[PDB]
Amino acid sequence: NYVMAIDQGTTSSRAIIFDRNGKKIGSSQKEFPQYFPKSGWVEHNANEIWNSVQSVIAGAFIESGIRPEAIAGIGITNQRETTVVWDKTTGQPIANAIVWQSRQSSPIADQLKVDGHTEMIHEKTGLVIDAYFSATKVRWLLDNIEGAQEKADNGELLFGTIDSWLVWKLTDGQVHVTDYSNASRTMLYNIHKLEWDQEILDLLNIPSSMLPEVKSNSEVYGHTRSVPIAGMAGDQQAALFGQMAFEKGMIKNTYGTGAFIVMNTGEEPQLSDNDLLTTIGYGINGKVYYALEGSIFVAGSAIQWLRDGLRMIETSPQSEELAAKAKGDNEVYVVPAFTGLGAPYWDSEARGAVFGLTRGTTKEDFVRATLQAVAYQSKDVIDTMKKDSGIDIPLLKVDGGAAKNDLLMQFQADILDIDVQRAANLETTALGAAYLAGLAVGFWKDLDELKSMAEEGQMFTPEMPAEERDNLYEGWKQAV
Amino acid sequence: NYVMAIDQGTTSSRAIIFDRNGKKIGSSQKEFPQYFPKSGWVEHNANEIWNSVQSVIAGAFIESGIRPEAIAGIGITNQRETTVVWDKTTGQPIANAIVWQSRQSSPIADQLKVDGHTEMIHEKTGLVIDAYFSATKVRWLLDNIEGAQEKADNGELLFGTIDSWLVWKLTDGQVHVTDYSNASRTMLYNIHKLEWDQEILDLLNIPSSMLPEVKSNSEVYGHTRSVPIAGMAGDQQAALFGQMAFEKGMIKNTYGTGAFIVMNTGEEPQLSDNDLLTTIGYGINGKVYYALEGSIFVAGSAIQWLRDGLRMIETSPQSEELAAKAKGDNEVYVVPAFTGLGAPYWDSEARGAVFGLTRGTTKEDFVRATLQAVAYQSKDVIDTMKKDSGIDIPLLKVDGGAAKNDLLMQFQADILDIDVQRAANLETTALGAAYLAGLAVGFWKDLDELKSMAEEGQMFTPEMPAEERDNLYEGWKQAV
């Protein structure tokens, strides 16, 4: 009896599986190309997204010995606001999946700042005008291609952030679906009414025939060859809900292709006046809830910066190792605004660079800068998160492959101040295709049965000088 | 409609989509680690050999967009002798599967030569006592595990190679199926009676509650949540059928991981006196046939040994390049006997050594002697094939992964004094399983429709360096 998944990575395409509690048993890997067309924009081939996905979902479906009168339904997940527009008959893309990182969706976002849509999108969707969301990217795919717009009203090409491309191309094409936290981020949805916003949908000229069905986070959707379809619900509303949310004001910190923070702030929408996002979190049974997320584009897109291209070294894991020999960190920097800054700033124009260059360095320190800025950008939205709620909360319930360390939670631990809970296992964002969507088939009924084991097996303490954290923040707003 | 060809390899597997009449529309090939712990015992992880098939059935049916309503048949090809025994109603081993290369099935192979089973196995199974076959392994199995003997008489233990492992489960845990081709490779089978040999079984303490229900190569064994299973064979008995042989005297040569030369010798069991094998081949409908087989072990894994563990050529095609710079070997002969040295000689403790070493011998004379060693091993079984049947080979037909090498196929022509015929579709191992899948469903009905696809691309005629063929062959037999 299984409750598995999918999830379309921005870097890789991978896979896994569970049973009776806590025990480890099967893993992965496989990387697909980060295609590059032009300036601002990062692209992914929609075919090599789906080639890679069922290359690994047909894999972890099986990792140590058995098969099917076991399996029992299909959940889903995908990548940030990535618009895939495909045909209904063939299932072939008309264009590649324009990544969340992409900034060619800025000319169109500047036109929305001149009209007066800033106070309308922020009070109905809870977000902010920036080339990060799907709405600004679907217009792009519909203004450049020949047919698209009046193939859309006939019902040929369907919009759907990758999750819907994963539900659809699985079930032959039977169930075209979404959820409450994927849709709340497409910038075409209303966070309060729980349906698709028609007021935004006009201005951008996008139809209602293209849009997927927004169902419950926890509900049976369809059937196919794998067996019953089940659920999906926001990755940052996943490490948020991953180290246990359900109640008010709960937070975390992701450490992947972008390091993001979110806050499960009650069944009440908290409005941000100083550029933070308000999206949809999740409760205990199958009902809606709210969340305060910031957002950053580079962290693991940073675990996409020193190695391959400007080759320097030779194997993935080790890097906690060249770290033990030079304390004072020689006047170095980084603004990882590769494809837009993200953080409070936003500023879809600001790019990944920093000045101050002078004679006495080798092949060494900006490994520190490539390893410096998203707990400054996470900080920029964490010191925009707790302020957005008025809290003083305890421990960081961190997650992400960079903290394969006695040193990320030792450097991701130096100024934020208070102390963290290093998740001795760090993929809690991807905690999202085996509980919520496991409650409706009547096999456990509810999220209240196993507590006396969570020993966060890794923690590294503070030790000698204690008067230094302030001025080394005061000047980051001059590079940014 | 389409047909799924399933190739199961030794270093890299495959699963090509097959339309109507000879076209390969979607293929993907990936690898798995060739782990090595001790002197001559290489073992694949059994825990690693399906997916480069449903990472290519799923992953390739996606390169086009084909879901099960269009596939007419699923046909499996596999690496032989790699045994797999099992509990009947659950999921995992205590280890993993031995490659047809491993040499620790030799202690008991010594005990069998002391008893007097040499004239009993050579006349009933047609093989020879070596650590190459399944039976020699399946002794140090039931004598080497916590259960297995009385656990067998309880109805659990079920024997079967990789062919039987991809297909036993291809039903709701029901059908227990093998083919005539891979069954003869187990050394637990009778080649004349067409049933399982109780005369070998007993001696090794192996029950009857084990062994699978041996069926045909082309028959419907069940259904799959892919659509029917209708084709079964090994990577060498199907590549024999894929090269359009069946008829008396038609031979081939596959350069995958090892150079295997199989010859069709009618419906008559030809006895070998020049140290070859007598296995089961394939006919035209779905019946039994007999064949003579050469052997040995390392050929394509020798080019891979220079790539992974020695870091000499960086990529596999590059061995062709670093071979045309030296003109000769400069008295250097490499014996690829890393895991015994099969062929006409085959024993089990022989290791890989380099003969005729000099300091003036650059990295170019070593890389060439590794490719010529592939061509020298092919000679050892061709002159042996001529002495057993009595038919001299005019034109030698080839296929495989190391057949794309123009220098290996030119040297194979010069040292053999015989013409080398290379096909357009070199990866002919998957094609034999595709024709095996379609003949039981009713996709082609017979073979007279696939006669136009045996088109030869290039022809290698013996040039002038073919006069010094015996001077370079006698230096090889002194190194062996």
Side-chain angles (χ1 to χ4, degrees), chain A residues 207-344:
Chain A
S208 288
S209 294
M210 285 176 80
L211 306 170
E213 197 186 329
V214 57
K215 278 200 204 168
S216 288
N217 302 148
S218 172
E219 191 205 299
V220 184
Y221 309 147
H223 220 99
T224 189
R225 280 172 223 171
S226 321
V227 41
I229 301 192
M232 47 250 236
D235 98 301
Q236 293 322 301
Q237 296 122 301
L240 155 82
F241 195 38
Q243 310 249 359
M244 173 80 140
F246 158 56
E247 312 265 72
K248 311 186 184 191
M250 311 217 160
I251 329 177
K252 49 95 190 169
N253 217 322
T254 244
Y255 289 114
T257 335
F260 330 70
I261 286 121
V262 189
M263 177 176 302
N264 230 212
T265 21
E267 41 192 12
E268 300 272 287
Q270 304 278 57
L271 300 51
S272 180
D273 298 274
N274 250 38
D275 16 65
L276 202 278
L277 318 151
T278 310
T279 177
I280 281 167
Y282 178 72
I284 208 169
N285 279 127
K287 301 133 195 168
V288 200
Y289 212 75
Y290 294 94
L292 277 171
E293 176 187 334
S295 283
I296 298 82
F297 319 145
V298 181
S301 196
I303 292 184
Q304 242 134 129
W305 205 80
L306 284 151
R307 298 168 70 209
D308 206 8
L310 29 325
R311 234 160 174 178
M312 333 245 9
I313 15 260
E314 248 286 292
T315 315
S316 187
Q318 285 185 61
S319 209
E320 189 208 306
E321 316 277 77
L322 236 31
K325 229 179 144 218
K327 36 97 175 123
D329 210 285
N330 292 0
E331 336 280 282
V332 81
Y333 276 138
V334 136
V335 167
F338 294 23
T339 40
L341 213 356

Side-chain angles (χ1 to χ4, degrees), chain A residues 30 47 50-51 54-55 58-60 62-67 69 90 92 169-170 172 225, chain B residues 30 50-51 54-55 58-59 62-65 67 69 90-92 165 169-172 225:
Chain A
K30 274 202 275 216
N47 278 126
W50 172 241
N51 272 127
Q54 257 263 357
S55 82
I62 245 192
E63 248 67 46
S64 272
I66 77 145
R67 274 133 95 263
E69 291 272 275
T90 55
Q92 288 289 310
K169 286 281 266 188
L170 227 63
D172 271 273
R225 280 172 223 171
Chain B
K30 295 111 162 182
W50 294 3
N51 236 144
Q54 215 178 114
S55 168
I62 278 136
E63 294 262 48
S64 297
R67 218 125 301 122
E69 298 276 284
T90 349
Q92 52 153 10
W165 183 241
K169 44 215 315 209
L170 260 178
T171 31
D172 278 284
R225 291 208 207 142

Side-chain angles (χ1 to χ4, degrees), chain B residues 101-357:
Chain B
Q101 292 176 310
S102 322
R103 302 298 107 185
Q104 184 46 220
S105 310
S106 314
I108 353 146
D110 283 312
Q111 294 289 309
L112 248 73
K113 291 177 184 63
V114 180
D115 290 325
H117 201 57
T118 316
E119 294 292 288
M120 283 296 273
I121 195 275
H122 194 60
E123 296 294 290
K124 277 185 179 181
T125 326
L127 313 167
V128 35
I129 311 175
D130 205 273
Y132 179 45
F133 310 102
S134 283
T136 9
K137 312 162 184 188
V138 186
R139 298 154 199 174
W140 231 55
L141 258 69
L142 272 58
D143 304 331
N144 275 238
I145 212 50
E146 297 174 348
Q149 279 291 321
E150 316 312 293
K151 252 172 188 191
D153 305 297
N154 285 138
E156 303 313 302
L157 272 284
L158 296 186
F159 172 70
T161 47
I162 294 193
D163 74 294
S164 245
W165 183 241
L166 302 195
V167 159
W168 165 74
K169 44 215 315 209
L170 260 178
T171 31
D172 278 284
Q174 327 287 335
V175 104
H176 204 9
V177 161
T178 329
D179 48 271
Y180 289 124
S181 293
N182 292 64
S184 55
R185 289 274 116 180
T186 63
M187 204 161 81
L188 290 166
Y189 195 69
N190 196 302
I191 211 178
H192 295 113
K193 296 175 184 179
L194 262 60
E195 279 293 285
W196 294 91
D197 208 56
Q198 299 289 293
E199 288 290 290
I200 299 159
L201 239 81
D202 288 333
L203 233 75
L204 339 177
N205 290 118
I206 290 158
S208 280
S209 288
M210 275 172 89
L211 331 154
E213 188 191 332
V214 63
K215 284 191 188 172
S216 301
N217 290 106
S218 192
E219 197 207 290
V220 184
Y221 325 107
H223 209 77
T224 180
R225 291 208 207 142
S226 347
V227 280
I229 330 120
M232 282 324 290
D235 59 332
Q236 310 302 291
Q237 283 112 320
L240 169 70
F241 175 55
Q243 275 271 326
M244 290 302 276
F246 127 65
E247 267 303 79
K248 297 176 181 186
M250 295 184 90
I251 332 180
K252 62 107 201 142
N253 199 347
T254 308
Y255 296 90
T257 304
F260 304 101
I261 312 202
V262 206
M263 169 186 225
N264 280 225
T265 36
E267 47 184 14
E268 294 275 284
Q270 290 284 329
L271 285 59
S272 187
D273 292 288
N274 286 85
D275 295 293
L276 282 186
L277 305 170
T278 308
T279 176
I280 285 162
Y282 188 62
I284 213 154
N285 290 118
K287 285 153 190 173
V288 202
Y289 214 85
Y290 296 94
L292 284 170
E293 191 178 295
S295 59
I296 254 268
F297 305 0
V298 187
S301 263
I303 308 153
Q304 188 188 128
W305 175 68
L306 303 163
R307 198 241 300 269
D308 297 303
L310 249 65
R311 306 166 196 163
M312 292 280 280
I313 48 170
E314 276 285 280
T315 329
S316 294
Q318 287 246 25
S319 54
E320 188 191 323
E321 269 276 83
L322 280 66
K325 299 165 75 173
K327 287 183 181 181
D329 290 311
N330 207 18
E331 293 291 283
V332 184
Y333 292 100
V334 179
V335 188
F338 306 117
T339 47
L341 176 21
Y345 325 95
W346 56 311
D347 48 6
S348 278
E349 296 257 282
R351 299 297 167 248
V354 198
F355 294 91
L357 278 169

Side-chain angles (χ1 to χ4, degrees), chain A residues 446-465:
Chain A
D446 202 0
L447 310 176
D448 245 9
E449 273 264 321
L450 86 159
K451 224 201 272 162
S452 49
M453 97 196 230
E455 315 272 58
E456 303 223 13
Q458 283 301 278
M459 270 183 248
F460 353 96
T461 203
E463 348 254 17
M464 271 274 79

